[PDB]
Amino acid sequence: FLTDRLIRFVEEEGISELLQSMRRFTIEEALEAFREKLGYKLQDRVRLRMAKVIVDLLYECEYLEKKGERYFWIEGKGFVDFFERCIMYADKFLNGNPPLYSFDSASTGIWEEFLGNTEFRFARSVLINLLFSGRNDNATVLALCYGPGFDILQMQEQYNIRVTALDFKDVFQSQASRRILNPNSVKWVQSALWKGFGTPLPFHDTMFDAVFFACADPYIPEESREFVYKDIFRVLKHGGILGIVTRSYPDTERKYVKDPFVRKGTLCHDFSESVCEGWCGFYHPQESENLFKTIGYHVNTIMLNASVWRLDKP
Ligand SMILES: Nc1ncnc2c1ncn2[C@@H]1O[C@H](CSCC[C@H](N)C(=O)O)[C@@H](O)[C@H]1O
């Protein structure tokens, strides 16, 4: 299991030994001790975040209790995977080595194997039915940040839609074309027309019946996330729909992410994919719902522990 693997990492790197010897710590004190005692170079946001995720996971797994903002180590009384490869590298990354993977040509096979997994296929299929079930055929849909094209493939498997495909790099386009059911029917937009998150989408206002946005939310920088979703709102027709597949950072309130296995799994996913170039991490679900509402979306559906979102433009 992935959680057991990350716990084994925590123990083998001496993180658990350090924290139990400290006995009590705030997140700030723990991060200072990771720097001073383990020698981690927490020199950027993504590495500082990984260290925070480790503490959050130890708390979720009941190694720690919390009073106010202070954690306490709980003393016990007497008597092959993409994720595996990420965790195998995490010690090197935390010591300041470059990201393990990126969205460049050399890494395309890695992403193809990872994003083809059954859990992603399930989440995409649910969202596709949420967006298109019961609709008139041949909706105009933007497949945004489509990568290897599993999203386009599943959309064409399930429904007759007119896909416009856009990514911020063109490194996957040939692989996606050789995967989907109807490559001639797709409007492939050249990646030179869109620098990516933070730049306006190269489409006019109110053009699309739907925007499909799967597994790309955690690559949006915090500084740009409001704009990215406002700009998507701009290109949707009134009555159009934005579908998101992501994960939600486990919420203390347990309002959105309830399944204990999923709460642990999301933390381990976030820690692991932090070794990939550009990872920003999963966002808090209450803040996401608040953001979508202020932009002007109606929150039609939140499902799968707040991993699948249907957002309608009124
Ligand atoms: N800074 C950035 N701006 C726009 N897209 C970005 C980006 N960083 C990553 N991405 C894109 O986000 C995607 C992450 S992988 C998800 C691919 C596909 N949607 C699927 O469901 O499997 C990739 O297409 C990647 O090119």
Q: Give CA angle at 74 (70, 79), nearest 5°.
A: 175
- HEC readout, 64-78: EEEECCEEEECCCCC
Residue with tokens 């170039």: 277
Bridging pattern class, strands 236-245 and 298-303: unpaired
Residue 138 token pair: 């041949």
Burial string for 97-110 (b: 16+ CB within 10 Å, else e) reads: eeebbbbeeebbee
CB-ligand 1 contact for 50 (6 Å cutoff): no
- Give the number of other CB atoms < 10 A from CB of residue 253: 10
For the Cβ of 197 lying below 6 angstroms from any atom of ligand 1, the answer is yes
Buried b (16+ CB within 10 A) or exposed e, 79-93: eeebbebbbebbeeb
DSSP string for residues in 142-187: EEES-TTSHHHHHHHHH--EEEEEE-S-STTHHHHHTTSS-GGGSE
* Ligand 1 geometric centre to CA of 286 (Å): 23
Distance, CA of 15 to CA of 39 (rounded, Å):
11
Q: Check pocket membership of 273 for ligand 1, CB cut-off 6 A.
A: no
Q: How far is the CA of 36 from the centre of ligand 1 (A)?
A: 35
Using what technique was this structure determined?
X-ray
Quick check: CB of 216 below 6 Å from ligand 1? yes
Q: How far apart are CA 34 and CA 235, in angstroms?
A: 45
**CA-CA distance, 210 to 131, in Å (whole number)?**
8
Residue whose CA is at the smallest distance from ligand 1 atom 14? 216
CA of 218 relative to ligand 1 center, distance in Å:
9
Backbone angles phi, psi at 94, to 5 degrees: -65, -25
**Does 81 count as an annotated binding residue?**
no
Is residue 14 annotated as involved in ligand binding?
A: no
Please check whether residue 16 is in contact with residue 10, taking contact to mean a CB–CB distance below 8 angstroms: yes
Residue 252 contacts residue 222 (beta carbons within 8 Å) = no
Of 257, 259, 261, nearest to 249 by C-alpha is: 257
Return the sign of the alpha-carbon dihedral for residues 166, 168, 170, 176: negative
Question: Is 124 marked within a binding site?
Answer: yes
Tell me the three state secondary structure of residue 308.
Answer: strand
Report d(CA 51, CA 237) in Å as an integer.
Answer: 42
- Compute the distance between CA of residue 96 and CA of residue 47 in angstroms, rounded to an integer: 9
Domains in the chain, ordered, with CATH?
2-94 (1.10.10.10), 105-248+283-312 (3.40.50.150)
CB of 211 within 8 A of CB of 232? yes
- Torsion on CA atoms 57, 59, 62, 67, rounded to nearest 10: 180
User: What's the rounded Cα separation, in Å, for the pair 197 and 157?
Assistant: 28
Closest CA to 154 of 126, 184, 134, 178: 126
Q: Give dist(CA 33, CA 14) in Å, integer.
A: 12
**Any known ligand binding at 167?**
yes
Regarding the beta carbon of 115 and ligand 1, being less than 6 Å apart is answered yes
- Ligand 1 midpoint to CA 220 (Å): 9
Q: Residue 210 to residues 35, 131, 306: CA-CA distances in angstroms?
A: 46, 8, 20
Nearest CA to ligand 1 atom 21: 214
Burial of 137 (0-12, 13-18, 19+ CB in 10 A): exposed
Ligand 1 contacts CB of residue 168 (under 6 A): yes
User: 92 in helix, strand or coil?
Assistant: helix
Question: Breaks in the chain follow which residues, C to N over 2.5 Å?
Answer: 79
For residue 165, CA distances in Å to 186, 188, 213, 303 come to 7, 5, 11, 25
Mutate to test the pocket of ligand 1, among 82, 102, 103 (most ligand atoms within 8 A of CB): 103
